[PDB]
Scaffold this active site. Structure first.
Site, PDB file in Angstrom:
ATOM      1  N   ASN A   1      -1.576   5.439   3.014  1.00 40.45           N
ATOM      2  CA  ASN A   1      -1.773   6.146   1.765  1.00 40.45           C
ATOM      3  C   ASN A   1      -3.012   7.023   1.798  1.00 40.45           C
ATOM      4  O   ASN A   1      -4.137   6.593   2.067  1.00 40.45           O
ATOM      5  CB  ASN A   1      -1.916   5.125   0.576  1.00 40.45           C
ATOM      6  CG  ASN A   1      -2.018   5.654  -0.866  1.00 40.45           C
ATOM      7  OD1 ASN A   1      -2.046   6.879  -1.128  1.00 40.45           O
ATOM      8  ND2 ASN A   1      -2.082   4.715  -1.825  1.00 40.45           N
TER       9      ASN A   1
ATOM     10  N   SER B   1       0.814  -1.177   0.000  1.00 40.24           N
ATOM     11  CA  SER B   1       0.000   0.000   0.000  1.00 40.24           C
ATOM     12  C   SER B   1       0.854   1.236   0.000  1.00 40.24           C
ATOM     13  O   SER B   1       1.773   1.361   0.783  1.00 40.24           O
ATOM     14  CB  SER B   1      -1.049  -0.045   1.103  1.00 40.24           C
ATOM     15  OG  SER B   1      -1.685   1.213   1.212  1.00 40.24           O
TER      16      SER B   1
ATOM     17  N   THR C   1      -1.086   2.162  -8.490  1.00 38.28           N
ATOM     18  CA  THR C   1      -2.135   2.908  -9.150  1.00 38.28           C
ATOM     19  C   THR C   1      -1.567   4.050  -9.992  1.00 38.28           C
ATOM     20  O   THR C   1      -1.901   4.240 -11.158  1.00 38.28           O
ATOM     21  CB  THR C   1      -3.179   3.330  -8.110  1.00 38.28           C
ATOM     22  OG1 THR C   1      -3.758   2.182  -7.518  1.00 38.28           O
ATOM     23  CG2 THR C   1      -4.253   4.202  -8.693  1.00 38.28           C
TER      24      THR C   1
ATOM     25  N   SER D   1      -6.162   2.492  -2.635  1.00 38.01           N
ATOM     26  CA  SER D   1      -7.163   1.805  -3.399  1.00 38.01           C
ATOM     27  C   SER D   1      -7.722   0.753  -2.501  1.00 38.01           C
ATOM     28  O   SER D   1      -6.943  -0.058  -2.033  1.00 38.01           O
ATOM     29  CB  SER D   1      -6.494   1.088  -4.539  1.00 38.01           C
ATOM     30  OG  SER D   1      -5.842   2.042  -5.356  1.00 38.01           O
TER      31      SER D   1
HETATM   32 MG   LIG Z   1      -3.755   1.573  -5.547  1.00 38.65          MG
END
Ligand SMILES: [Mg+2]
Length: 744
Positions: free
Chosen positions: A229, A180, A185, A233
């Site tokens: 984060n 993470s 992403t 996500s």
């Molecule tokens: Mg992500």
């Protein structure tokens, strides 16, 4: 050509800076070094120790302090010659031990060179700051360039996949995994941005716009602020970028997995609920609010528990705009947009429901404002809702009877209702988006998998097993793929196991694996976590070598994963596997007057799984499909790595990093590779650097292969240390270093 222009931003940001001369002479030195642990209290902390002497069996070297220690030659982590400091491919190093590998990564990272290859892998380390290497200008440099022709970059592997797709007429895949906050992403967005450019239908683009605008939509609903984060996500995804026989983007499809529906009702402290909640609350017009009975986050139970209601340097209001904007571009109708926002609101309202006891043991609703509010936005009947929550009708065989849930029971039900709505709304979002972008008639595709690598937390639950299960399969996939490619390579030049057990323990049928036993217990309404864990231990404790029953804990068990042992906690698994929602709740909502709501409860594709199958069975099934697809592609692997646990730049922690490289296949890969002929150089290349080592050869000779042998011969190198290939000289570990170490 910025590639040839040493003053360009290309050189500046993606390359080790080059001086005037390239002469071998420059890097000459008599010192020989070694990598050591300043103390085994650590192990990943190493220091450079210079070899002051050696015996026929071991080395003696001084430490930083000037303390002399000794090591076995066979246990020594020799340091590569300075020339190797900064190479773009880990496969280029002669000594391939762990410290060495970390070193090369570090040197590069100290130059803000976040990307490095490792054989088949692209390793990407999060800089935790901005690096302007993602411009259109930047995009333009990677076009049609070979891997060996340009610096390491996400754009490079993207270009390589694109070309292979066109040249081989074979679908492609990019697997981007890691921890993470690692940057999966972000890299996934670059991949798409690149493809959209090198394959988009120019002039100006629409389809392309829609494609681009999809993520933003999904991020608003599937991403949240967590301690690791700010824009985490909370779902995994596989993006299929579709192309026509001509190589032009023709569409795209999205497959979502493992959405953290639980985050809707509860967030850890400092964390946040899903972005949209904040987006709506902030960005909604003073008028929309009134129609939504919206207040501030503080006024909502589902948004006022963590203590964090905003993100540093983030305008939820401005994000909202972006979010609606995208919705507009994809094609969501103004009505549709309202309902979505209505669902968002109603959910917030549901969470603001306060059940009370007293009367008896059964729940009551003294105040119904929250309830009324949620009913209006949802467009359902409050009384039905009310009943459905506190007095669901339950089947006792032949008898269908309404129960009187207590507060706790009532509350969990509400929570279930909220999670069902969120997740289905998500599912629906994806489906809508797909309807607009997806093409039933694609020729080719490039799929991007943006999902976490192994998860080893303080506490590991059902969801962790799942993702961990996926990772076993992905790692096995890499391994098989590494096998074939290495074989080929050796065969094109003329030269010369383990994951199933863990997988079987998890998904086996007969003998039944973890998931199978879970499902079995699942049929029994009265089963408990204890019945379940007992069953588990009963079939694996001292029976399966990948399984471990804890010394004292009664609620956990461990599995030996590729990454190592993971301890799992059984609590609520039974419930997670079934993911229940009171029938009357379904009935209430099935009558919704809302146009979107109806879909969430009336479309079997959205309101159900498969009589129906469990959550485990579905996960397994979706993983198999996924693997099936990947199987048909030429894959590319990206390992996103987190430099440290504090979201700080310029702070690459050896232990943090090394543990990531250990679990993600990188060090294994190397170990394996190091065992044969790790170094494989082009003849011409070799001679061009070493010619001056033998009294014979000239820099640029026509018989490069002969010229190679000359030096080698000259140098009297051990024949078993190298292998004459068709177009490459193959070297075993350490050989090339020594050679490097030779006098002109
Ligand atoms: Mg992500």
């Amino acid at each position: 050509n910025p590639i040839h222009d040493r003053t360009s931003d290309y050189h500046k940001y993606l390359k080790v800076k080059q001086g005037d001369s390239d002469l071998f002479k420059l890097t000459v030195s008599d010192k020989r070094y070694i990598w050591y642990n300043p103390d085994p209290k650590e192990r990943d902390s190493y220091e450079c120790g210079e070899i002051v002497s050696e015996t026929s069996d071991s080395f003696t070297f001084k430490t930083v302090d000037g303390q002399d220690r000794q090591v076995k030659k066979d246990d020594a982590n020799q340091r590569n010659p300075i020339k190797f400091d900064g190479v773009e491919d880990m496969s280029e190093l002669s000594y391939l031990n762990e410290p060495a590998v970390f070193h090369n990564l570090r040197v590069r990272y100290n130059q803000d060179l976040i990307y490095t290859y490792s054989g088949l892998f692209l390793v990407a380390v999060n800089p935790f700051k901005r690096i302007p290497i993602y411009t259109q200008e930047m995009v333009d440099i990677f076009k049609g360039r070979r891997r060996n022709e340009v610096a390491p970059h996400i754009f490079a592997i993207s270009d390589v996949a694109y070309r292979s797709m066109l040249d081989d007429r074979q679908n492609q895949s990019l697997l981007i995994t890691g921890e993470s906050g690692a940057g999966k992403t972000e890299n996934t967005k670059k991949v798409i941005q690149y493809l959209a450019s090198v394959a988009g239908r120019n002039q100006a683009g629409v389809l392309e716009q829609q494609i681009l605008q999809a993520n933003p939509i999904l991020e608003a609903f599937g991403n949240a602020k967590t301690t690791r984060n700010n824009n985490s996500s909370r779902f995994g995804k596989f993006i299929e970028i579709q192309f026509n026989n001509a190589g032009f983007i023709s569409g795209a499809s999205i497959q979502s997995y493992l959405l953290e529906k639980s985050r809707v009702v509860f967030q850890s402290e400092t964390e946040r609920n899903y972005h949209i909640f904040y987006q709506l609350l902030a960005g909604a017009t003073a008028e929309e609010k009134k129609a939504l009975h919206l207040a501030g986050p503080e006024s909502f139970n589902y948004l006022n528990q963590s203590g964090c209601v905003d993100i540093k340097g983030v305008s939820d209001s401005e994000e909202f705009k972006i979010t609606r904007q995208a919705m507009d571009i994809v094609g969501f109708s103004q009505e549709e947009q309202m309902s979505i926002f209505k669902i968002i609101a109603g959910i917030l309202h549901l969470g603001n429901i306060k059940f009370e006891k007293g009367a008896g043991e059964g729940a009551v609703l003294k105040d119904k404002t929250a309830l009324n509010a949620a009913s209006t936005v949802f467009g359902v009947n409050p009384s039905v809702l009310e009943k459905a929550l506190m007095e669901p009708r339950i089947l006792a065989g032949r008898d269908l009877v309404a129960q009187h849930l207590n507060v706790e029971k009532s509350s969990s039900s509400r929570d279930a209702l909220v999670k069902a709505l969120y997740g289905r709304l998500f599912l629906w979002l994806v489906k809508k988006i797909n309807n607009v972008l997806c093409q039933e008639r694609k020729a080719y595709f490039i799929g991007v998998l943006d999902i976490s690598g192994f998860e080893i937390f303080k506490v590991n639950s059902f969801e962790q097993l799942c993702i961990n299960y996926t990772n076993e399969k992905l790692q096995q996939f890499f391994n098989h793929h590494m096998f074939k490619l290495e074989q080929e390579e050796y065969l094109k030049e003329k030269i010369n196991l383990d994951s199933q057990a863990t997988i079987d323990l998890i998904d086996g049928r007969q003998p039944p694996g973890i998931l199978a036993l879970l499902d079995e217990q699942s049929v029994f309404p009265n089963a408990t976590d204890n019945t379940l864990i007992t069953k588990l231990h009963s079939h694996f404790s001292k029976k399966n070598a990948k399984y471990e029953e804890p010394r004292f804990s009664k609620t956990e068990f461990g599995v030996t994963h590729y990454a190592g042992q993971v301890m799992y906690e059984i609590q609520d698994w039974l419930e997670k596997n079934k993911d229940p929602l009171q029938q009357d709740l379904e009935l209430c909502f099935k009558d919704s007057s809302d146009n979107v709501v109806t879909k969430l409860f009336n479309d079997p594709n959205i309101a159900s799984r498969a009589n129906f199958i469990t959550v485990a069975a579905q996960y397994k099934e979706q993983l198999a499909s996924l693997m099936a697809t990947l199987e048909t592609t030429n894959p590319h692997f990206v390992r996103c790595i987190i430099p440290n646990n504090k979201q700080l730049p310029a702070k690459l922690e050896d232990k943090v990093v090394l543990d990531q490289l250990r679990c993600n296949g990188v060090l294994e890969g190397i170990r394996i590779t190091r065992k044969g002929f790790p170094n494989r150089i082009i003849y011409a290349d070799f001679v061009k650097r070493y010619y001056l080592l033998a009294p014979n050869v000239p820099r640029d000779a026509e018989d490069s292969q002969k010229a190679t042998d000359a030096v080698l011969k000259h140098l009297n190198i051990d024949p078993e240390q190298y292998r004459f290939g068709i177009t490459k000289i193959f070297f075993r570990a350490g050989q090339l270093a020594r050679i490097e170490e030779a006098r002109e």
